Design a binder for this molecule. Structure first.
Ligand SMILES: Nc1ncnc2c1ncn2[C@@H]1O[C@H](COP(=O)(O)OP(=O)(O)OP(=O)(O)O)[C@@H](O)[C@H]1O
Ligand SMILES: [Mg+2]
Ligand SMILES: [Mg+2]
Lengths: 385, 380, 51
């Protein structure tokens, strides 16, 4: 509350100050155009008529010629002319070629594709750590694999043990698995890549395997990293059937990722967060520990856990201090943390029908009936016989 | 309450404008690679740009008729001739040619095909691993020495017995058996070249493009002497047929077929060993499994108790351990399983000790790590 | 007068051969943007003065 206000005051004088500084600083009159810049500039316009049709450098022959494939089915045996060093260019690089005559005018690309930008989602994690009402014990298993080598390399180095490779998150939805994922992400401040596995299920020829390779390249470039392959099972054990053109694709994608997860050796610097509902009643495709190490089963919320979650929610409510908190959680059997979240939302909705702006003392005892009854129907547990 | 609501509302606008101001910062300054003295290069470069000898359109001889019949890659055929002077003996079926944009004459013969260059990126040279620190005392480790080393080191004995030299080994085992690990170790020790092919990567298809790559790579090998060609994960693509499906597919039968025929019948080889990595022999087409392709098959056998104490020790050395720690006792409690399972147990024992705030892992830690892994596998 | 002008203007627009449609993949500081021109391959091309 107050802690948040203190911060607002500082954030609004930082932005203001920066913005004003920036005019001058960027230039607006500074206008570097002295001999070093002028050189670059003059040359660049002359040489480069535009548009410039990109290539891929297939091989070099030492005689300042290269062999490139252009987007046209005819390839072109080109001169290297001007700019980019011969050494700096290594085969497999994507390159700028001049449209009048194809010559290597430089590189600025590095095999830039839109696919990498899409995946790249470092962007502000919605979760900070321990905003969540989850239990200390569950998060301090994910943290142990992922955080702990980055914060304290001293202990791992001294022991001599390798840093762990991967974790698997599985529950039980409504244990806030993806909340957990973005709690971890905030702390590390690592490049947080995300890709969903259904984008790798397509009828399109061979595209799945191409995508799989991209992922390892991306993580390594932007290391240290966490790669969230979310619904890993979409590619794997989970299905899209084979009487739909799937007798080609699904096999090739599953194998491909599998082969790169082992690799010639575990990378040991790319953390993974693998999501899947549970691989207990599903087939396992996440191929043995040492490449996925510690595997994390989140408990179904017990009575003490939901107390902590419940405390967040009751703060905004007024007239729930007279209501005894303890008795609402007990009376309900042990159930999802999602069901306490559902209850809070329903509770407010319900107060409005009574016509009271925020919950009445009565409204809260009533709220429990509607949510418990709905949820037990949705999910029925074996009846004791 | 209310006068402090409006403090939030102000905050939000600011943060958004700063982010757009990044574009303005980057500015308009353009500068390209070629520092120190490669911008003085550019001055030479200018006059030669206006000059003409580049590009050359690339085409490929498809027949030499004593002029030449060239076929371009857009698919269009021409009769052409020699340019400055291009010897007849240089131009061969499959040989690329450099021809002019529109005056259509050969300047330089160019080395055949652009497809080796693409696939030579995948190829990795003689990997190195030390055979001594290869876990287990496996029987499998020994039969690899017979296949690979002994024909290369002493081809004489094989001639004398009047057996054929062993050249094919099929590796299969559960994941974490160490198929990749042992192949790298015998590549190193025997001092023979190595060719990495990954069959899972084949996707370039036009009905039989995958078949072109495979013929070229295997042929690359023959040219090479004392070499290994390791086709990795041929479980699918050049592995299983997808004919079985309702609509089905046969781009995989093309790739599969080509490989079978290169192996089957006469065809020279320059001491080419054939290593095949399949997770399961079941997935592998039976055509390949049954003999006259790969000579030998070994079913990997999970490490012995002596071999399992042995892998654990390798790990325990890397670790900081208790003095008098009973490696053998830990191993016995542990299932008969891969070298992998054992790698994991040492990983978690390390971590629980760190959590508990110890720098030396106790015997007790590894009792905990074991209990963890058994349960995992079981529950699934 | 304006109608005679109008019919003429309609005439002059239509002439234009080509005319496409790309998407800005990323932006660089060189007074350029990399565009994957959609019917074609890729082109890294300078900006017009207007935008
Ligand atoms: N002999 C061994 N000694 C110690 N650890 C071993 C041994 N063999 C394999 N491992 C361990 O198992 C894991 C994978 O080994 P490796 O990469 O060779 O697997 P593979 O059987 O070839 O599998 P894939 O099916 O993924 O191709 C590693 O964690 C490695 O340390
Ligand atoms: Mg979720
Ligand atoms: Mg392997």
């Amino acid at each position: 509350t107050r802690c948040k206000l203190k911060l607002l005051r500082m954030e609004r004088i930082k932005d203001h100050l920066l913005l004003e500084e920036e005019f001058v600083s960027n230039s607006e009159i500074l206008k570097p155009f002295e001999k070093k810049q002028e050189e670059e500039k003059k040359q660049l316009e002359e040489i480069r008529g535009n548009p410039l049709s990109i290539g891929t450098l297939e091989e070099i022959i030492d005689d300042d010629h290269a062999i490139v494939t252009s987007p046209t089915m005819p390839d072109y045996y080109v001169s290297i002319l001007s700019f980019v060093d011969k050494e700096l260019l290594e085969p497999g690089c994507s390159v700028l070629l001049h449209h009048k005559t194809m010559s290597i005018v430089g590189v600025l690309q590095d095999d830039a594709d839109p696919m990498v930008s899409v995946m790249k989602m470092d962007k502000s994690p919605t979760e900070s750590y321990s905003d969540i009402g989850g239990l200390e014990s569950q998060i301090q298993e994910i943290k142990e694999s992922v955080e702990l080598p980055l914060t304290h390399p001293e202990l791992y180095e001294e022991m001599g043990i390798k840093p762990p490779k991967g974790v698997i998150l599985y529950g039980a939805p409504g244990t806030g698995k993806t909340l957990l994922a973005k709690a971890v992400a905030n702390q590390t401040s690592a490049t947080f890549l995300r890709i969903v596995g259904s984008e790798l299920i397509q009828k399109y020829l061979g595209d799945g395997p191409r995508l799989c390779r991209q992922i390892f390249k991306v993580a390594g470039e932007n290391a240290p990293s966490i790669v969230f392959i979310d619904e890993i099972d979409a590619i794997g054990t989970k299905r899209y059937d084979s009487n739909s053109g799937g007798e080609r694709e699904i096999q090739r994608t599953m194998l491909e990722l599998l082969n790169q997860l082992d690799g010639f050796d575990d990378r040991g610097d790319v953390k993974v967060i693998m999501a899947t509902n549970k691989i207990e009643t599903l087939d396992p495709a996440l191929i043995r520990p040492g490449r996925i190490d510690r595997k994390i089963l989140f408990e179904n919320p017990d009575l003490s856990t939901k107390k902590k979650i419940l405390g967040i929610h009751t703060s905004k409510m007024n007239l729930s201090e007279d209501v005894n908190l303890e008795t609402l959680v007990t009376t309900k059997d042990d159930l999802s943390g999602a069901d306490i979240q559902a209850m809070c939302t329903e509770a407010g909705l319900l107060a409005l029908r009574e016509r009271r702006m925020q919950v009445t003392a009565e409204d809260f005892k009533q709220a429990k009936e509607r949510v418990m009854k709905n949820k037990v129907e949705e999910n029925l547990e074996g009846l004791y016989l | 309450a209310a006068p402090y609501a409006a403090k939030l509302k102000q905050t939000e606008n600011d943060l958004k404008d700063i982010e757009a101001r990044i574009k303005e910062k980057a500015g308009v300054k353009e500068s390209d690679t070629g520092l120190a003295p490669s911008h003085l290069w550019d001055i030479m470069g200018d006059r030669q740009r206006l000059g003409e000898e580049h590009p050359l359109q690339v085409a490929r001889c498809t027949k030499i008729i004593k002029k030449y019949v060239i076929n371009l890659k857009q698919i269009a055929k021409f009769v052409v001739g020699l340019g400055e002077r291009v010897s007849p003996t240089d131009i061969e079926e499959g040989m690329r040619v450099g021809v002019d944009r529109s005056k259509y004459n050969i300047e330089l013969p160019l080395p055949p095909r652009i497809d080796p260059s693409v696939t030579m990126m995948t190829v990795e040279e003689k990997p190195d691993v030390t055979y001594s620190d290869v876990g287990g005392c496996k029987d499998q480790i020994e039969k690899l020495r017979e296949v690979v080393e002994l024909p290369l080191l002493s081809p004489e004995r094989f001639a004398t017995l009047g057996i054929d030299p062993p050249k094919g080994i099929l590796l299969y085992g559960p994941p974490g058996t160490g198929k990749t690990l042992c192949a790298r170790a015998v590549a190193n020790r025997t001092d023979a070249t190595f060719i990495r092919v990954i069959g899972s990567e084949l996707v370039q298809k036009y009905v039989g493009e995958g078949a072109r790559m495979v013929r070229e790579l295997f042929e690359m090998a023959r040219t090479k002497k004392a070499c290994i060609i390791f086709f990795d994960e041929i479980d699918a693509v050049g592995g299983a047929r997808f004919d079985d499906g309702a609509g089905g597919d046969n781009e995989v039968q093309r790739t599969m077929l080509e490989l079978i025929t290169q192996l089957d019948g006469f065809d020279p080889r320059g001491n080419i060993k054939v290593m095949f990595a399949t997770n399961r022999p079941n997935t592998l087409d039976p055509a390949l499994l049954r003999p006259g392709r790969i000579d030998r098959k070994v079913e990997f056998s999970l490490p012995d108790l002596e071999g399992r104490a042995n892998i654990f020790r390798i790990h325990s050395k890397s670790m900081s351990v208790e003095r008098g720690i009973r490696w053998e006792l830990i191993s016995r409690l542990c299932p008969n399983s891969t070298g992998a399972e054992l790698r994991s147990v040492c990983t978690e024992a390390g971590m629980f000790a760190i959590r508990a705030r110890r720098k030396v892992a106790t015997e007790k830690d590894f009792l905990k790590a074991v209990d963890k892994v058994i349960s995992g596998y079981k529950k699934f | 007068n304006d109608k005679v002008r109008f019919i003429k203007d309609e005439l002059r627009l239509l002439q234009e051969p080509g005319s496409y449609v790309g998407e800005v993949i990323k932006i660089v500081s060189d007074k350029k943007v990399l565009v994957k021109v959609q019917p074609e391959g890729k082109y890294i091309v300078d900006v017009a003065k207007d935008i």
